[PDB]
Amino acid sequence: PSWPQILGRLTDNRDLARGQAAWAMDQIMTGNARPAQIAAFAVAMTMKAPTADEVGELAGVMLSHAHPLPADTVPDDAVDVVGTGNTVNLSTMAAIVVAAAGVPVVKHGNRAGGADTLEALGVRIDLGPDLVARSLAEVGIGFCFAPRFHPSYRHAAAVRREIGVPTVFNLLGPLTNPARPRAGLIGCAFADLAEVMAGVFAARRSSVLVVHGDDGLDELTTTTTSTIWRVAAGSVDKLTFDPAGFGFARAQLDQLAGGDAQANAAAVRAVLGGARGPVRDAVVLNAAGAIVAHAGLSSREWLPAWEEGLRRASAAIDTGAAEQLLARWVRFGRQI
Amino acid sequence: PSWPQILGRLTDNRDLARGQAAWAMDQIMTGNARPAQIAAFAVAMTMKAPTADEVGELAGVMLSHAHPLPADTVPDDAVDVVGTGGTVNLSTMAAIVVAAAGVPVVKHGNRAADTLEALGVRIDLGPDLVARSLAEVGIGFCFAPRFHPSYRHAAAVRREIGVPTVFNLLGPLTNPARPRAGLIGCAFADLAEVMAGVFAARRSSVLVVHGDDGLDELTTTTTSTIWRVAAGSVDKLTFDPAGFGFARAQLDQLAGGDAQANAAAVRAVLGGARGPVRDAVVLNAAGAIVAHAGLSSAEWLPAWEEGLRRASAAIDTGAAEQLLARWVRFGRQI
Ligand SMILES: O=C(O)c1ccccc1Nc1ccccc1C(=O)O
Ligand SMILES: O=C(O)c1ccccc1Nc1ccccc1C(=O)O
């Protein structure tokens, strides 16, 4: 293959042949692509409209280059909780809540960011595979820092900053978690691509809820209904989801969006401390979603699973388990 | 204005606001663009489908920055003869024939200019000597790097990505001598109409030509699509050389791109060798002469018939051959 062949096919608005998206990503990840070529591909692959096959090839190449976690250190039922983007405030909190409920959580992220909010809370985010594994076992949660696990990605990273608008590369985060969890609640800000992401997870037979707030949030919203793509047994299933059916009062968006890392950390402490309000509700809702996805690994029933998910997430906060888990996560990083 | 605003608008499949393409190109030429931004912009505008307004803004900024020719040195009726690429042999020969017919020609090009160098022509002259060449010889060649230095970053990015983009239109659109007429070839059927719109807006008299076999010149193997530009309007036409008694040729008969080879092909044609290459040269030269005629008035058929007689006579009288010799002599004597 070649750049002119691949870019020419993309500018002609044609889907790529099998292996072409992979070849391209591999050039990018082996330092063999000029910034102009990386940018050209990023843009053309966005404007053509990427397929699940193509996105899966890109994620596949990244994971084939990534540092893995040591063998048998990631439980087969670990989950991820994340949005493509922020609702880092929400996903950070929901992840802690889910871990506290007893579902192993391994996240993947970077500073902008998922990572910023965590280190603001005193968590050590930049850990190698060995210690992420130990964190998962000892604390029940781990965080894989993208530069540490995908160092070959640095050339693409710099180019994304330079062009500064979202591309197909914005989709790859939840799809390139180096711990490779098989379940998750995965938010997508662009509804066009949510269905594509769901297809990618379906191909690897994950149990995920790919979620899109019909108000545009990359998380389950309480502002409006949400679209859920329920991925289980290699199958996708598009549903509309109303948290009103679980008693959630309607909030308005400006109450829910993330802010900077220091502000995110403050809201985390408030919620985990027991503050009620729309932020808590959104956390409980998204945490339950990850639990429902976790349940889908050994698939039972939709409403019962949600009702259980909600009880578990609520109790994890209310008993103080979530708050304690965060405290223990911090102690872990200091004692390591 | 900002790069993320402009690139986001393009990736959203939206036409730019007035001034935005201009701003982008000005950033590119004032050193304030990263290779990645330049590439993203060229690709995004291509996939969005560029408008004549947009491409015009791009060309406008380039020409606003370019080294001009000295005042009153370019005749009001000067013409260009050139294609986008995607027929340097054909356009080089046609330009010589047109100049020898008495229509001032000022070309704009770059090396990959090589074929002319092989013929002994001096390609890298500054504004004053191109002006002198045009007056003394009847033809001048503007070396693109010399007249568009601030464009070097963009030109490099174009090569790095390889795929054709809207940037492939900018060369023929930014002749620094600004001739008002021309035969302009475009290898990309989807961009040729946009390119014609740009020439129309600047009130040029141009034939934008696209061979229906993919050539960026008037072809002899089959029909060509011509966007006829005059009086600020564009008329789309299909052109068939058979209507003027030209036999069909095959694309291979027209082939070659080496320097010594193409120099040899120029000498053979200007020396009177007959066949498909001469026919194609005569066709494209007549087209340039038709565009030249369009500056003042207009009848398409008489114009072509006169263009064809003039092109043929310029070769047959030896005037074209002598003009090249005089061009070579000019550069050697400075
Ligand atoms: O910055 C990122 O988002 C990033 C993500 C994945 C891998 C590398 C990354 N960045 C870097 C890491 C080491 C040195 C330079 C860079 C750089 O930004 O140029
Ligand atoms: O071709 C070069 O290497 C070059 C070098 C320095 C300045 C400009 C250059 N090229 C151009 C000039 C005008 C219009 C289009 C181009 C182009 O090549 O796309």
Classify residue B233 as exposed, middle or buried by CB count within 10 Å of its CB (0-12, 13-18, 19+). Answer: exposed
Classify residue B72 as exposed, middle or buried by CB count within 10 Å of its CB (0-12, 13-18, 19+). Answer: exposed
Give the method used.
X-ray
CB A238 within 8 A of CB A229: yes
A26 shares a domain with A93: no
Q: How many domains does chain A have?
A: 2
A247 shares a domain with A125: yes
A322 shares a domain with A219: yes
- Residue B275 domain boundaries: 75-334
Q: Which residues does chain A have within 8 Å of residue B37's beta carbon, measured at their own beta carbons?
A: 39, 162-163
B238 shares a domain with B123: yes
Q: Which of B32, B49, B66 is the last residue of a domain?
A: B66
3-state secondary structure of B237: strand
B120 shares a domain with B60: no
Q: Which of B39, B66, B93 is the last residue of a domain?
A: B66
Phi then psi for residue A104, to 5 deg, are: -60, 135
Tell me the resolution in Å: 1.8
Residue A156 Cα to ligand 1 midpoint, Å, equals 8
Measure CB to CB from residue B36 to each of A3, A48, A159 and give the nearest one. Answer: A159
- How is residue A192 written in tokens? 């066009």
Strand (E) positions, chain A? 79-83, 105-109, 141-145, 183-187, 207-213, 226-231, 238-241
- The domain that contains A241 carries what CATH number? 3.40.1030.10
- The Cα–Cα gap between A186 and A208 comes to 7
B252 shares a domain with B317: yes
Residue A62 Cα to ligand 1 midpoint, Å, equals 14
In order, the DSSP letters of B126-179 are -HHHHHHHHHHTSEEEEEHHHH-GGGHHHHHHHHHH-S--GGGGHHHHT-TT--
B171 shares a domain with B223: yes
CB B184 within 8 A of CB B172: yes
B314 shares a domain with B205: yes
A197 shares a domain with A90: yes
A148 shares a domain with A127: yes
CB B288 within 8 A of CB B182: yes
Interface residues from chain B to A (CB-CB < 8 Å): 3-4, 7-8, 11, 13, 34-40, 42-44, 46-48, 157, 160-165
Contacts of residue B43, Cβ cutoff 8 Å, sequence gap at least 6: A7, A11, A39, A40, A43, A44, A47, B161, B163, B165
Residue A219, marked binder: yes
- The domain that contains B44 carries what CATH number? 1.20.970.10
Q: Which residues does chain B have within 8 Å of residue A11's beta carbon, measured at their own beta carbons?
A: 43, 46-47, 163-165
Q: Which helix (H) or strand (E) holds B226?
A: strand B224-230
**Whose Cα sits closest to atom 1 in ligand 2?**
B155
Q: Which of B24, B48, B66 is the last residue of a domain?
A: B66
Which residue stretches of chain B are H helix? 3-11, 20-29, 35-48, 52-65, 88-100, 114-118, 127-136, 144-147, 152-161, 170-173, 189-201, 259-270, 276-293, 300-316, 319-332
Classify residue A297 as exposed, middle or buried by CB count within 10 Å of its CB (0-12, 13-18, 19+). Answer: middle
B298 shares a domain with B176: yes
Which residue of B12, B161, B165, B167 to mutate against A (max A Cβ within 10 Å)? Answer: B161
B119 shares a domain with B3: no
Q: Which residues does chain A have within 8 Å of residue B38's beta carbon, measured at their own beta carbons?
A: 36
Q: Which helix (H) or strand (E) holds B205?
A: strand B205-211
